[model samples]
Target chain A: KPQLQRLAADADVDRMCRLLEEDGAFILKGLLPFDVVESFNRELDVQMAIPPPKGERLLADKYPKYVPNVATTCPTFRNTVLINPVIHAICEAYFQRTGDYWLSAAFLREIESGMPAQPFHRDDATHPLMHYQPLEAPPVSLSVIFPLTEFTEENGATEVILGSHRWTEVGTPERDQAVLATMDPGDVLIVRQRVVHAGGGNRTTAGKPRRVVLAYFNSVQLTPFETYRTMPREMVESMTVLGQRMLGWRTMKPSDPNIVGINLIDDKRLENVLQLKAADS
Target chain B: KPQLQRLAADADVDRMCRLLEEDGAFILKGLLPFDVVESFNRELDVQMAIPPPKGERLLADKYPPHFKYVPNVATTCPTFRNTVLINPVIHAICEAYFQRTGDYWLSAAFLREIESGMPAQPFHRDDATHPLMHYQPLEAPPVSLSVIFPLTEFTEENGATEVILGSHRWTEVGTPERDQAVLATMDPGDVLIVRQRVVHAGGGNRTTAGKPRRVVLAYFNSVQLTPFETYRTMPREMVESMTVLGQRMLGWRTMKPSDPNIVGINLIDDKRLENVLQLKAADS
Candidate 1:
C-alpha cells in the first residue's frame, strides 16, 4: 500500500519532469510494450552469455553482477531504450529548468532472489560536492530505472522517499519515510539526483530475475570529449594506441597513460598496442 | 611594460573575466589606490619587522622563496579587508568563472617572499589539490583561482610570477614541458588573476639589490573542493566587526548555497560563531 503515484505511459513529458521535481520519483506505467522488453532481455542474454574478460568489469561491479557497457554490448538496448524520446524529453525539461544535461551513465542490472536490500543513498553522491550540498538550483544528475520484469515488494523493488530531493538539512533522510516502487514490466521509474533510494531485499521464494535497465543524466558541467567512435580496421592499423583510443577502445587500466583505448581488433589487443616502439603508442 | 596587456582599474569586470578565461592569467592596473597600497606596505613592514616566530611562517617556509602566512590578513591589514577581499570586480569575475552563487572562499592569504638566490619553482596548478578531471573542454568552469597583489613593484629581474599562457586549455597528463612561461611583471596596485588550472610558479628573485619581493597571494575556491583543510577560529566579536562577506568566507557564518549543492556544516550547531566566542573568549 505504498502511496507513490503511478502515471500512464502516455502522460505529458513536462508533467512527469515536474512530478520528479516535486516528488523524488514516480513510476510511468508501460513506457515500453511487452515485445520490446522481451527483445531487450534476449539481447542482454546474448551480450552476457560469455563472462567479461578478467579485470574488464566496471570498477563499481561489487554489487550483484550487471551487463556493463550496455551501449555497445547490446544494440537492442541502444536502439530501443537509449533512443526513447520521452525519457530524453523529461531529462531535457528537468535540466532546462535551471541548466543543461548530458546522458552520463547507464547499465543493465538483474537483482537475484537472495540479494539483500541496498544501503539507501542519493544517486548524486557520484560527485563529492553534490553530496555535500542538497539540490539547490538544479540536480547534478537524474536516474531512470526501466524494469524489464515486474518489480514487486517481495522481488527487490526500489524503495524511494517522496520529496527527499527537497530536503535541505545536512543529514540523511529518514528511512521510515520511504515508499516502494512496485511496477510492472515495461514500466519506468525516474529518480531525482538528491532523492534517497535503494533496492529492497528479495524475499520471494521463487528465484525469478528482477531485470532492470539503469540510466543517469548529469547537469552540464563536464565537457563531452570526442572519444567513442568506430574506426575502420585499415585506419586503426596505421594509427597508434592513442588514436585508437580516441576512436573507440575501452580503457582497461586505471589511469594507464599510454592508452588511447582498451581492447580492439580482439580482446586485450590495446594493451599490447600500448607497448609500441616509441611514445606514439 | 611587460608584454602582458594591462587593462585599467576601471575596466569592465566581464571583459576581465573573459580575458582571464581566454589567457588563463591577466594583469589589472591600478586596482588599488596608491594610498591604500602604501598603507598595506607600511602595515606589512611594521608587522613583519621581526621574522614570524619559528614554526609559524607557513608549511612551505622550509623551501627557498617561502610563502609566509599572514594568518588573518582581514585583521592584520584593513587594506586587504576593504579592497582585495570585497573587490566587486574580482568577486564578480570569480562568480562568473563558477557561473553560480557558489559564494566562494579565500582559503589562504599569504606573502611569497622570494629571495634573490631562490630558484624558480616548478610550474604546477593550484587546483591539483582537488581531484578535478582535466583535458577538460575550454568551456569548463574552474574550481579555484589564485590572485596576486604585489605590495612592492614587480619586475622580471625581481622574479614576478611566471605563467604558461593558455596551459589551462592543454591536456593535463601529457602536456609537453616547455619554457613557454612568460614573466608576469606588474607594479604596485596592479592585480594578477590566474585560473587554478594554469601552470605557474614564483619566478626566482635574481635582483642584486634590496629586500625579498613581498608579493601578496590569495587562493580562492568554490564553496566545495576546499584547498585549505581548516579555517583557524577567530574571536567572535572580532569577526562580527568585519563585513558580511568576510564573516561568511571565514567560517563565522553558516554558509548558504543554492539547493543543488549541500549547505556547509557549522562549528557546533547553528550558533557556530557564538560557540567559538564563548570557547575561545580571552579570559578578560
Candidate 2:
C-alpha cells in the first residue's frame, strides 16, 4: 500500500510531476497562502448564504450536499481555484500537454455531520476511452480537491486507495489500505483521473458541514462535463486573455466556409457574411 | 488628406496602435515574406478551382466574376497558418488596440476574389455587431480589428481596397471626397490593418484582361462580440494535428464552460449529468 507524498511550497515542479507519475497522486501542502484560502472561503460562505435557486441542488436530501457550477456563479471561485497554477502545472504534466487543458467541471461539496461514506470510484469513468487505453496511458484528465476548512476523520476527509490508478480490475478497496487525506486549509489533493477515491463520512456529533471545492481539468481532446457556452458577455469581455481562454470564450473557429450561421446573441454583423454568401451562390 | 502610413517590419507596436487609432488604418509593407505569399496563393488557386456549393457565392452575377466564400482556409493551408493566422505582429497590435485587457479571437476569415467587371463595394463601418453604446460619444473599447492580406498585386486596375482616411473618428461620416479616398495598393506580401470603425470598400475591377484580385480578409474581435456562431470549425483530427500555439490561435483551447454548445463532438454518451440528476431525484 502507498501513502500520498506531501510536498512543501517551494517543491520543484519536475519532482512534483515525477511523484505524481509514480504514485498517481500527491498533496501540495500550503500550496496556496492561508490568507488566500480564507478569503475564498469567505466568499463561498456568502454565496451559500443565499438560498439556492429552485432545483439547483444536486443530492439535496443526501448528507453531502453538492453545488455544481459555483465557478459560473462566483468570480472568486473561478479565479482562485479553477485557474490555479499548481493544478495547471500538474495537468500539463499529467496530460503531457501544455496550455490546452480545460476545466471540465467545478463544484462545491459539503459533508454534514453523520453523513455516510461514499463508494470508491474513478473520476475518469466518465471518459469513454479510459477503459480502452493501456495502463500507462497519458492522463486524459486530473481532479483537484481543496478543503476550505481543515479536513479530519471527524469531518469526513476524503480517502484514497493507493496505486489504484494502475489497477487493471475494479475491486473494492480493503479497509486497511485506505488512506485518510487529512489536510489543512490551503492544502490541495491532486489525483490522477483514474485514481480510485471515496469521500469519508462525517462521524462527529457536531452539526458543521465539511466544505471543499472540487474541480476537474481535462485535456482539450475530451469533452468537458460543463457546457460553459453562455456566460454573460460583459463579464467575459472584461477578463484577461488568459481568463477568457480558461473560461472557454475563444474555443470555436471557422473551419468551413459554407456552414456559417448567426450567433443570435452578438452576431448582428452576421448579415454581412450571409449577404456575401447569398450573393456569391 | 491623410494617407495611410506605411510601417517597416521593425515598426514599434505602440506606434502602430497609435497610428491606427488616429488614422483608422495603416499598411505594413512586406509583412509576410514573398515565398509565403506565393505558397498561400497557390493554395487559394487550388481552392478556387473547386466550385463553391449551392448558394455559397456572396457577390455572384455582380462582381467581375462570381466571388466564392473560402473560409477556414487557415486550417487547411499551413502556409496561411504560419504567415497570416498566427502572425505575432498582428496579435500584438490587436492586443494593444483592445487595451490588453481582454482576449482577442479570430472571429471571421475568408478570401475575396474580385474578377474583372465587379462593381465597387459600399463603404461602411465594420461594427454592425457592436452595441448601440459603442456608437455614442467616447464610445466603449473598439469591438474588433480587421486585417487584409493581398495575395495578388493590388493595382488600380486590379481593384485595390479604397479607404476614407480618419473616418473612424467621425461622428457622422458624409460623402467622401473622391480625391481623399486613398487607393490602398499593395504587393503580395503587404498587409492592411484597420480598426473596425474604419470606412472602407472593395474597389471595382476595371481592367478588361487583368488578373483577378485575390485577398484574404480576417477579423479579430474582443471575446464578447461574436458575430457568427456557426462558422464551420476544422474537424477534431485536423485541430489535433497542429502545434499547441497554432491550436490555440485556431480556437481549440478556448471553450467556456458557460457556452451553451459543446466544444467538440463527443464520442461517448455523456451520462454524468443524467446520473447526477437521477441520483438527486432519488435522494429527494
Candidate 3:
C-alpha cells in the first residue's frame, strides 16, 4: 500500500516528506502512455537514416547503436514527451517551493545491445558555479528518464546507488552498486542529481535496441544550452503550452524586478525558421 | 565606353578569357541591386547581436571593424549584393574562354580613418597548392571584384587605390602606369582582381569621419580555393541537376567518397536534420 494513502489530504505533505526522507528517489510507473513512446521512437528511427556531420565518427551498426540528436534539426521529442502533466506534478513535488523553473537539457539516447557504460559522476561537478544553501545539499536538479524500450536488468537498465544523495563527499566508484532500473515503456525514473548512478551494461544478444528519453531539470530560468538557436520555430510553435514552459517560457507571478535582459521572442522566431533576428537590447 | 560592355552576352567563354589576359580579374557592375545590399546588411547587423556561444569571445565591435559575416554564415559579402548572369557577348569580348576560374576567398574589410595610416599592408599572396595551368604559363587563378558601393571620384583625396594594369608579368612591384578608378554610390565599380595590380593607402580624412563609402567585395566561385561547400539547401532533385560548377561548390562530386562520420550533433536523436544524405548504392 502507498504509505501516504491513509493520511488526511492536509497532512499528506508531512507523510510525503517522510517518504522522501526514507527513499531519496521516486518512481511514477505507467505515467507515459504506450502509444506516445512508440510514436516517438519510430520517428527517431526515421531521422537516423541521414548521415552525421563532417569529422564525427558514426556508431557501428551493432547492439546499442546510437546517433546524437542534439543541434541537428527540429526534434520531435522536444514536443511529445516533455510536456506531460504528470511530469510537472513530480517536478513540483521534488522542487517543493522553488520560485523558478529551468531546463538543464533535453536529449535522446538510443541504447542498442544495451552495452555502453557511463561512470558515476555527480551532476554538480560539471555545472557552472552557483550558490548552494546547505553546503551539504548541492543545488537541487532533476533527471527524468523515460524508457522507450521495455527496460530490464537483462538489457542494460539504469542503476542507481541507493541513498547516495546523502553523501556530500565523492565516493570510490568500485564501492557503488550498479542498480539496473528495469522499467517498462511509459515508465519514468526521476532521480535526484546528487545521487551516484550509472547505466547498466546490456548483456543481451537480442538484436533489438533499447531507447531512453533523458531530460535534465534545473531551477535557474535561463538554459545553459541554447536549444532555440538550432531548431526551427514552427516545431516550437507546434508544441503545447506545457511544452513551451518546459523549454523555460513560463511567466513568474508578481514577477521579480531583478530579472531582466532575457527575451523569448527570438527563441520563438529562430525555433521556427532557424534564422535568428537582431537582439532588442 | 565600358571596355567589355558587348562581352556581357557570354562571360564564361569569351569575356572571362579576355579579361583574364588583360586584367587579373573582371567585374560586372550593378551585378546586384542596391536595395538587395541594403537589406542583407540590415540582417547581418542583427545576427551579430546574439550572445555568442559560451567560452567564445563576443565579436569585437571596433577595429578591422567587422569580419564575422564571412565563410560560414553568408558565403560571400555581408550580403548577396547582386546575382550575376554570365551571358555570351560579355564572355567573348573579354576573351575569357581559355581562362578557368580558380582559387577564391570570402572576406569583409572595413577600412576607417584610424586603420588607414596604420602600416603599409604587404602585397597579397595566394595559399593554394595546385598548378593553375598545364604549360606553367605564369598562371594564377582569376579573381573577380564586385563593388557594392556606387561612388564618384575614387581619388586619393578619399583613399581609393591606384591600380597598375598589365603588371602580372613582373614578380616585383614596378613603376606601373597609375589610374584612379572613380568609386561613387549607386554606380557599380568593378576592377579585375588579377589585372589591377593595385597598392592601397588610407584615403585622406578631409571630413571628420572621412572618405566616401567604399564597397566591401567578397571573392567568389574561384577554381583554386579548397573546394567550397555552398549552404543554399536547394531541393535534392533540383541540386542533382545543377551545373558542374554548381555541383563542385556543393561538394556533391568529391574526388573520393566521404567518410561516414557525423559532426555538430550533440543534443539527441537529431543527426542529419539539416545535412545532405546521398542515396546508398544498392547492394551488388
Q: Which candidate tops TM-score?
A: 1
Q: Candidate 1, TM-score vs. the true structure?
A: 0.50
lDDT of 3 by residue, A1-281 (tens): 12111222123444444434554455556766777777777677765776654532323322224544332342446665665666665566656543344455665666667366667755553232211223333234677777889877777777766666676654676523545667778777767656667766566777767777667776532222323323454555565655654553332211122122122122122122233222111
Span of ten consecutive residues with least summed lDDT in model 3 chain A: A252-261
- Highest-scoring model, lDDT: 2
In DockQ terms, which candidate is top?
2
How close is every model to the real structure, measured as TM-score?
0.50, 0.49, 0.43
Q: Where is model 3 more than 4 Å wrong at Cα?
A: A1-21, A55-64, A67-76, A114-116, A125-140, A175-178, A248-281, B1-284
- On TM-score, the stronger of 1 and 2 is 1
Could you list the chain B TM-scores for each candidate?
Answer: 0.82, 0.80, 0.48
**lDDT: the better of candidates 1 and 3:** 1
**Interface RMSD, every prediction, one decimal place:** 18.8, 16.5, 19.5
Candidate 1's C-alpha runs over 4 A off are: A1-281, B1-3, B53-58, B65-72, B132-138, B173-179, B227-232, B262-284
Interface RMSD of 3: 19.5
Model 2 lDDT tens row, A168-273 = 6558776567788899998998887567888887888778888888877765434455545445555555545445445444442211121222231122233333
Off by over 4 Å in 2: A1-281, B55-66, B129-139, B173-177, B227-232, B255-284
> Measured against the native two-chain assembly using Cα atoms, what DockQ does each of the candidate structures obtain, in the order listed?
0.02, 0.05, 0.02
Tell me the RMSD of model 3 versus the true structure.
17.6
